[PDB]
């Protein structure tokens, strides 16, 4: 029900906007996670149903309910940022449990971001 878009080749120090389009979006808290080469999964950032954000300050989140979309902005890319980025939706209200993958029920396919130069 979720599709991430926008990944690609990007420069260190650059900026990148990813989008996660949802197929009743307003009733879900939305989170972004990432899996880098080697690393295990990392929480990135989440925005609750109510509009409140939970952070892991280069990664920011907005939700356009009227476009059924959540955006991840990465400002000032770093080599650590090479990863597949996953969007996820949870039926939970906002809490620090939105930093945990186990809280989410629906997930996207991921979009790959490669920091290079
Ligand atoms: Zn914060
Ligand atoms: Zn809009």
Numbering used by the authors: 4 to 26, 29 to 61, 66 to 126
What did the publication describing this PDB structure actually write?
By rationally engineering the surface residues of a model anti‐VEGF nanobody, we obtained a series of anti‐VEGF nanobodies with identical protein structures and VEGF binding affinities, while drastically different crystallization propensities and crystal lattice structures. Anti‐VEGF proteins have been the cornerstone of wet AMD therapeutics, and approved anti‐VEGF proteins include ranibizumab, aflibercept, conbercept, brolucizumab, and bevacizumab (off‐label use). Here, we successfully changed the crystal lattice arrangement of therapeutic nanobody (termed mNb‐WT) by rational mutations of surface residues, which remarkably reduced the dissolution rate of protein molecules from the crystal into the solvent. In summary, our findings demonstrated that the protein crystalline form can be modulated by rational surface mutation without impairing pharmaceutical efficacy.
Unexpectedly, mutant 7, replacing Q14 with N14, resulted in a radical change to the protein arrangement in the crystal lattice. The space group of mutant 7 turned into a P212121 lattice from the P1 lattice in mNb‐WT with only one protein molecule in the asymmetric unit. The crystal morphology of mutant 7 was prismatic crystals instead of lamellae. Unlike mNb‐WT crystals, mutant 7 recruited zinc ions rather than sulfate ions to help align protein molecules in the crystal lattice. Every mutant 7 molecule interacts with another asymmetric unit mediated by two zinc ions. At the first zinc binding site, the side chain of the D60 residue in asymmetric unit A, the side chain of the D111 residue in asymmetric unit B, and two water molecules formed a strong coordination unit with the zinc ion; meanwhile, the two water molecules also created typical hydrogen bonds with the D60 and R108 residues of asymmetric unit A and the D111 residue of asymmetric unit B to strengthen the periphery of the coordination unit (top diagram). The other zinc coordination unit consisted of the side chains of residues D73 and K76 in asymmetric unit A, the side chain of residue E45 in asymmetric unit C, and one water molecule. Interestingly, these two coordination units were identical not to the conventional zinc binding motif, the classical zinc finger motif 29 or histidine‐mediated zinc coordination among protein molecules, 30 but rather to the central catalytic core of metal‐binding proteins, such as retroviral integrases. Unexpectedly, the solvent content of the mutant 7 crystal was 21.92%, the minimum among the protein crystals, indicating the most compact molecular arrangement. For the P212121 lattice, zinc coordination of the mutant 7 crystal further strengthened the molecular interaction, leading to a slower release rate than mutant 2 crystals.
